[PDB]
Design a protein around this nucleic acid. Structure first.
Ligand SMILES: [Mg+2]
Ligand SMILES: [Mg+2]
Ligand SMILES: [Mg+2]
Length: 799
RNA sequence: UUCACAUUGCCCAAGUCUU
RNA sequence: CAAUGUGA
């Protein structure tokens, strides 16, 4: 239940392709380095303050200690050669513009043992060793640049990327030390994030309040101006030599604001006559004291990342400033590494480390896509080309016959007229007839409505009046709270199928849009759009098997009380195509799925009810777990799956395959040959697979870019097998995973992650919609909100 | 709320110390 | 999913 399986073999399927990865080979010396535990009293200091302390400490004691050590900003210091210490704590006293620093040797870290672990010699990779190398590579940039996670950001020289609102774009790069089949690798990728400009607060006001210049005007701000400004600068730090954090903007101008007025105080003591006394002051420091700074004598301090959400316009600017095709990104990574010059870094060089300046070459394989079987009389077979196919002259494998349906238009009648609805209905019936999902009649019901209050009574009337009602098509004017209400009533209250459509897609229809629309409708009504060509599937389908997709979605940044949402879906046929969903609310920002055992039990029960088979195997696709959570998550969740089986029957012990899916990492793959690049974005082809060189030295993992890259640089999904009772070969599991990317019903394309994992996202996001403005007695309220109706339980409402 | 892809938002990481 | 783009 605890240790991941070794790599069974290497894949052999598919034609080869020359790739370049943003991994850079590291040459590590085979010598012991020396680990020391520090202490710094007081120890509530920010991490960067601790780096200053040790930095000054190193030189302020250079003489009979420290004859170029590295430091993690907390508690760990490393040297390439040993110090004079013994094992003794050597408390030092250091002063920086009153600190006690204790230095104690702890262990010897052998880089020799790392070479063995990267080889077949040692069974596993020693974390503490890679942890040390990480501190070596991060030492310099952690003081030179502004750390954000595993990245480093800085104001770009000579350029300025303003966002407005006192914000601008800082470019940066991600850095991480990784073991691999070949060598140690330095993974480098470029990135960009928003920062507040280091400008006078006076000019910060102008951008926030949209003033061309101050003295526009010379009257104290309106309360509406003062409230907007207070929201932006509160929590931000400002400087004079001495730095404060802003907690409040005073109501009264500096001329009147008394504590002795602020204006007066600065006239006598500091001999400063304020140029804009009519403006308020910044209350800084402790909220329960009376320290007020005029705007004129304050600057926003540099290197403060913008945590708040960007505006629509700010986002739009951010996108344009950082959007890059795959070759363009490739060159920006390359240019960065040449200019980075990691080998002159004195700390990197103290530890005798060398970093390759060229991207690593890696050979991938482009897997063949599966054939997609359709229905109708002809039973057409689609052949994905470059990750895409279409439904033209093809009918659904199992198309639904729609006899009873209705339209509910919440768009204004002037904007969405009966003629519009009629034409839309005309075209939709045409497309749906072609697709093998005939809408036999005009809707038995069609009424306009307004507001969220009209939803439930209308839907209740519909359910009571029209027997055999299959669907309600809901027209929406755009972004409106009605949508969430439609889904609350439909999914959870009354248990009725609904398909919403934006007004603009009714006024002006297209064959493609209407086609995609039918894909959702047919699925929602129990249909089967298409299936994998049966004889083209991997051998695993010879026995009953269920495919589980699982994901947790956490609240946005800055949020503190909203629940995390766990969603799990399971296949309900042998194709596989039909899926049922389970969903739960759980603790804030907890990744481990707490109630998984219960959820899997439901899915296993519903699988048997649907197929009359008991799975002999369980394939578990787990999205979004990082390497630092593999053991924790696997321990709880693998056992939870077993628990579900055991509490059901026997002696029922199906083989479990546990696979972690990671779409969001920092590995990027590029075509070496320009003639391999695909489309305008110039990305690697769909099906590109990498399970060598850059992958894990001992464990079963691979990259699979299963989708066509439309824009930017494609994210190759990474798959890591944490458990496998079924003993998959690399070829079978990679093909299986790839084929499951072709079973996503909402489009005739290969998607970036397997359908079950994708559905899990959709289910989680739907639950989040049921919880809008609603997020023991607390838990049960939220739990009921995400609980769907009895009639919705076995449906694909999430489509 | 036709859909995918891409950027950010999500576990780990990161962050958090005389007017 | 939301914002913003590229696309069908
Ligand atoms: Mg997740
Ligand atoms: Mg943490
Ligand atoms: Mg969007």
């Amino acid at each position: 239940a605890f240790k991941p399986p070794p790599r069974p073999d290497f894949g052999t399927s598919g034609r080869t392709i020359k790739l370049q990865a943003n991994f850079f080979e590291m040459d590590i010396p085979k010598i012991d380095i020396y680990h020391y535990e520090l202490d710094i009293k007081p120890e509530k200091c920010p991490r960067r303050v601790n780096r200053e302390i040790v930095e000054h400490m190193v030189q302020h004691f250079k003489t009979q200690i420290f004859g170029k050590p590295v430091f993690d900003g907390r508690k760990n210091l490393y040297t390439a050669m040993p110090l004079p210490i013994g094992r003794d704590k050597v408390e030092l006293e250091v002063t920086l513009p009153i600190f006690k620093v204790s230095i104690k040797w702890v262990s010897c870290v052998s880089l020799q043992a790392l070479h063995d672990a990267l080889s077949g010699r040692l069974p596993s990779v020693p974390f503490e060793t890679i942890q040390a190398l990480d501190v070596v590579m991060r030492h310099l940039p952690s003081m030179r640049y502004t750390p954000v996670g595993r990245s480093f950001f800085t104001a770009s020289e000579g350029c300025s990327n303003p966002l407005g609102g006192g914000r601008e774009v800082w470019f940066g790069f991600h850095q991480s030390v990784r073991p691999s089949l070949w060598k140690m690798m330095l993974n480098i990728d470029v990135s960009a994030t928003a920062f507040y400009k280091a400008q006078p607060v006076i000019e910060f006001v102008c951008e926030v309040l949209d003033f061309k210049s101050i003295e526009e005007q010379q009257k104290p701000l309106t309360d509406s101006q003062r409230v907007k400004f207070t929201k932006e600068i509160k929590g931000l730090k400002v400087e004079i030599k001495r730095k404060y954090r802003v907690c409040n903007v005073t109501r009264r101008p500096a001329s009147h604001q008394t504590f002795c007025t602020v204006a007066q105080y600065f006239k006598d003591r500091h001999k400063l006559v304020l140029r804009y006394p009519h403006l308020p002051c910044l209350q800084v420091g402790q909220e329960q004291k009376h320290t007020y700074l005029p705007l004129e004598v304050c600057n926003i301090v540099a290197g403060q990342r913008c945590i708040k959400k960007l505006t629509d316009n700010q986002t739009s600017t951010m996108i344009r400033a950082t959007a890059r095709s795959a070759p363009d990104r490739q060159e920006e990574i390359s240019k960065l590494m040449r200019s980075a010059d990691f080998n002159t870094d004195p700390y990197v060089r103290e530890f005798g480390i060398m970093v390759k300046d060229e991207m690593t070459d890696v050979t991938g394989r482009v897997l063949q896509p599966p054939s997609i079987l359709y229905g109708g009389r002809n039973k057409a077979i689609a052949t994905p080309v470059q990750g895409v196919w279409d439904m033209r002259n093809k009918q659904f494998h199992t198309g639904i016959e729609i006899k009873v349906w209705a339209i509910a238009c919440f768009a204004p009648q002037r904007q969405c007229t009966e003629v519009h609805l009629k034409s839309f209905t005309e075209q939709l019936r045409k497309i749906s007839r072609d697709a093998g999902m005939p809408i036999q009649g005009q809707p038995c019901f069609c009424k306009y409505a307004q507001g969220a209050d009209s939803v439930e009574p209308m839907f209740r009337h519909l359910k009571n009046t029209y027997a055999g009602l299959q669907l309600v098509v809901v027209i929406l004017p755009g972004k409106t709270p009605v949508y969430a209400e439609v889904k609350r009533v439909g999914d959870t209250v009354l248990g009725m199928a609904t398909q919403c459509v934006q007004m603009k897609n009714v006024q002006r229809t297209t064959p493609q849009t209407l086609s995609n629309l039918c894909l959702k409708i047919n699925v929602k009504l129990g249909g089967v759009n298409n299936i994998l060509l049966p004889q083209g599937r991997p051998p695993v389908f010879q026995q009953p098997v269920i495919f589980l997709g699982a994901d947790v979605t956490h609240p946005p940044a800055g949020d503190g009380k909203k629940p995390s949402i766990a969603a799990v879906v399971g296949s309900m046929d042998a194709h596989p195509n039909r899926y049922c969903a389970t969903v739960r609310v759980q603790q804030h920002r907890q990744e481990i799925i707490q109630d998984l055992a219960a959820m899997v039990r439901e899915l296993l029960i519903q699988f048997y009810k649907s197929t009359r088979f008991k799975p002999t195997r369980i394939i578990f696709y787990r999205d979004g777990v990082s390497e630092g959570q593999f053991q924790q998550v696997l321990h709880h969740e693998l056992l939870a799956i077993r628990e579900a089986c055991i509490k059901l029957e026997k002696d029922y012990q199906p083989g479990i395959t546990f696979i972690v899916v990671q779409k969001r990492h920092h590995t990027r793959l590029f075509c070496t040959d320009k003639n391999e690049r695909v489309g305008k974005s110039g990305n690697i082809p769909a099906g590109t697979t990498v399970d060598t060189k850059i992958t894990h030295p001992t464990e079963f993992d691979f990259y699979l870019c299963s989708h066509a890259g439309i824009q930017g640089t494609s994210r190759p999904s990474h798959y890591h097998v944490l458990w496998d009772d079924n003993r998959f070969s690399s070829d079978e599991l990679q093909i299986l995973t790839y084929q499951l990317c072709h079973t996503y019903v909402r489009c005739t394309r290969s998607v970036s992650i397997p359908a079950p994992a994708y559905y899990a996202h959709l289910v989680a996001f739907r639950a989040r919609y049921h919880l809008v403005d609603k997020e023991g007695r607390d838990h049960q309220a939220l739990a009921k909100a995400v609980q769907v109706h009895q009639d919705t339980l076995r449906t694909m409402y999430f489509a």
